[PDB]
């Protein structure tokens, strides 16, 4: 077997699966760990976008009532160190101690904010575990299939603690941990004791190449088998090589810009709305995305299933209203900083360049401020910044409620004073089953989100990868890389 060489845009701060939730972490943690339920993106000849949920660590499951799901676990599944996976490891993964409890905030900072209203799991036997919520939740199944639910070994994790575990991870996944050199690489090796489809690569290296041009030239040399986070502008050149090709897809993620609402200038919605209303998304999608990216009609995505609104109108573009809103606001022409980690996000810097020009035209002077990976400045030194949200549920709950909800980081850390109505509907949607009331509540939340502008949705990026033709791997409609039955050589 060949050793897989990946030229990536970035690396996560940790390999602890919840702390690895980013654009850069899932592509690694998906190799080290498994979930109870997994998604088959390639079901029924789909091009890496199938919504099909299949058994993984749980061979079967059954919803008992409105707040509990019993899982029958796959037997004799071994962790990388030889310890057998039991219901105890599953219970610990979803425990108050490790995940959603008050003390857990020091280990997994976003654990509670991203979790459901969990109640302590129930271990029925060695291979039977019931996951439960304190209040009704029809989201247990989707949460279990998500990036929040990768199963950790209880004894090893507790022995090391969350911080040391994130630097020496042990999972059940197809690839085991070899090395993690921060700001350089993550090396993994084949787990030949894997319960599922056998690893096809002997080794996997995720090498940071922050500059996309250095990344492209890296594949042409070729120092890499696959390179990530490209732009549709890189397409024609890579494809001009007979042994190289681009591989891309629209992913279940949106790019955005957001605000530090603790800053005087961003406390009121006026300037935030003015900046939102001047964003010309169709020109950005032509100039930088060559029609490949997509513009959602608000905080509304097809993956939401029953909570997606297909009748919803597009987000407003109104330069004249934006101009008036700048005039009415307290803003005085003082340069506003916009923080970006270079091109961590595809087209981050070219996108900002276009917006600075759009904003200059409405009377807002915006300045780019670059920061190195891991060198993000203190919160009060930042005003505007770019971000992305992976839509991780087959439901509208994620990410409006975990990110923008009353217990979320946009309101708590970033100072968004959300209207009472918004927070009230967030509570109803978490608890209500699907229906007219729930559908309408999500639509009213979407209306408040656009009126308030705590963040401004830009587009669903078209995720562009490039690879050696002799490396057979197909992208998935999510911000991760899948190698299970989706990696071979020659
Ligand atoms: C830099 C990082 C933490 O942000 P990123 O856009 O890579 O990851 C987000 C994550 O913060 C969370 O909002 C869920 O979606 C991810 O894309």
């Amino acid at each position: 077997r060949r050793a897989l060489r990946l030229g990536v845009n970035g690396l996560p701060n940790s390999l602890e699966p919840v702390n690895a939730i980013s654009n850069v972490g899932p592509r690694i943690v998906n190799q080290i760990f498994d979930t109870l339920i997994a998604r088959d993106f390639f079901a029924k000849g789909a091009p890496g976008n199938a919504i099909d949920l299949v058994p993984a660590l749980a061979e079967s499951w059954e919803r008992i009532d409105e707040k509990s799901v019993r899982f029958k676990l796959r037997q004799k599944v071994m962790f990388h160190d030889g310890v057998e996976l039991t219901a105890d490891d599953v219970a610990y993964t979803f425990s108050s101690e490790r995940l959603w409890g008050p003390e857990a905030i020091k280990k997994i900072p976003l654990g509670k904010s991203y979790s459901l209203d969990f109640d302590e799991p129930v271990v029925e036997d060695k291979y039977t575990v019931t996951l439960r919520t304190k209040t009704p939740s029809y989201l247990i199944e989707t949460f279990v299939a998500s990036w929040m639910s990768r199963i950790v070994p209880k004894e090893y994790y507790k022995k090391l603690g969350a911080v040391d575990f994130g630097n020496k991870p042990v999972g059940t996944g197809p690839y085991k941990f070899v090395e993690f050199v921060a700001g350089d690489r993550v090396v993994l090796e084949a787990n030949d004791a894997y319960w599922g489809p056998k690893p096809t690569a002997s080794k996997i290296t995720y090498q940071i190449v922050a500059e996309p041009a250095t990344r492209v030239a890296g594949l042409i040399s070729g120092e890499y088998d696959i390179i990530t986070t490209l732009t549709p502008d890189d397409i024609q050149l890579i494809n001009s090589y007979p042994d190289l090709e681009t591989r891309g897809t629209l992913i279940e993620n949106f790019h955005m810009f957001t605000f530090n609402m603790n800053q005087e200038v961003f406390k009121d919605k006026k300037l935030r709305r003015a900046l939102a209303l001047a964003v010309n998304r169709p020109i950005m999608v032509e100039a930088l995305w060559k029609k490949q990216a997509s513009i959602p009609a608000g905080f509304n995505f097809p993956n939401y299933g029953e909570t997606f609104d297909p009748k919803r109108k597009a987000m407003e573009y109104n330069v004249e209203e934006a101009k008036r809103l700048v005039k009415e606001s307290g803003y005085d022409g003082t340069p506003i900083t916009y923080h970006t980690m270079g091109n961590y996000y595809a087209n981050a810097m070219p996108a900002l360049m276009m917006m600075i020009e759009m904003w200059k035209q409405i009377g807002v002077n915006v300045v780019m401020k670059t920061y190195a990976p891991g060198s993000f400045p203190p919160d009060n030194q930042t005003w505007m910044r770019n971000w992305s949200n992976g839509q991780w549920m087959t439901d509208a709950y994620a990410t409006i409620v975990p990110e923008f909800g009353p217990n979320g980081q946009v309101q708590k850390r970033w100072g968004w004073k959300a209207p009472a109505e918004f927070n009230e509907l967030c509570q109803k949607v978490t608890v209500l089953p699907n229906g007219k009331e729930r559908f309408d509540a999500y639509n009213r939340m979407r209306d408040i989100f656009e009126e308030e502008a705590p963040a401004v949705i830009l587009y669903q990026p078209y995720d562009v990868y490039a690879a050696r033709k002799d490396v057979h791997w197909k992208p998935v409609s999510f911000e991760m890389m899948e190698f299970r039955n989706n990696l071979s050589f020659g």
Side-chain angles (χ1 to χ4, degrees), residues 51-201:
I51 68 155
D52 301 79
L53 259 64
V54 285
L57 291 181
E59 276 176 318
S60 63
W61 56 95
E62 44 181 51
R63 172 165 288 262
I64 312 162
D65 58 36
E66 79 287 351
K67 73 222 291 163
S68 61
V69 183
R70 170 138 73 232
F71 295 85
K72 299 288 178 186
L73 304 178
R74 195 175 299 274
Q75 302 188 17
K76 315 287 179 285
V77 170
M78 308 292 167
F79 278 98
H80 302 134
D81 55 10
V83 176
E84 199 197 334
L85 162 88
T86 70
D88 195 22
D89 302 291
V90 187
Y92 185 76
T93 300
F94 300 88
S95 69
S96 171
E97 202 212 299
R98 182 259 169 173
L99 184 72
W100 52 273
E103 70 300 274
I105 326 304
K106 292 289 173 186
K107 302 163 91 202
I108 304 179
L110 292 165
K112 193 189 206 83
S113 61
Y114 290 0
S115 283
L116 307 173
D117 179 32
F118 283 127
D119 193 3
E120 209 64 47
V122 185
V123 175
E124 309 215 1
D125 58 67
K126 193 179 170 75
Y127 312 109
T128 316
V129 61
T130 298
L131 299 180
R132 16 167 243 189
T133 59
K134 284 175 173 183
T135 54
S137 179
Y138 301 89
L139 311 176
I140 300 171
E141 297 91 338
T142 191
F143 184 99
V144 159
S146 83
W147 54 8
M148 276 300 299
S149 306
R150 287 176 163 109
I151 316 298
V152 301
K154 177 182 198 186
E155 308 315 344
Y156 179 81
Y157 192 109
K158 278 177 71 191
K159 174 197 157 200
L160 270 73
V163 182
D164 281 349
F165 178 88
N167 295 322
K168 217 176 165 178
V170 162
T172 64
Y175 294 91
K176 47 161 99 163
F177 178 75
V178 162
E179 160 209 305
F180 184 2
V181 176
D184 182 29
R185 74 190 77 201
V186 172
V187 185
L188 311 177
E189 74 183 310
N191 174 26
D192 299 319
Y194 189 49
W195 61 268
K198 44 299 199 186
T200 48

Side-chain angles (χ1 to χ4, degrees), residues 2-7 218-219 222-227 244 247 466-471 489:
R2 276 168 65 182
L4 195 70
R5 312 160 296 163
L6 311 177
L219 181 84
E223 302 312 307
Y224 306 106
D225 294 289
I226 309 163
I227 55 159
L244 301 175
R247 282 175 210 159
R468 280 196 58 83
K469 276 186 187 168
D470 67 346
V471 180
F489 312 100

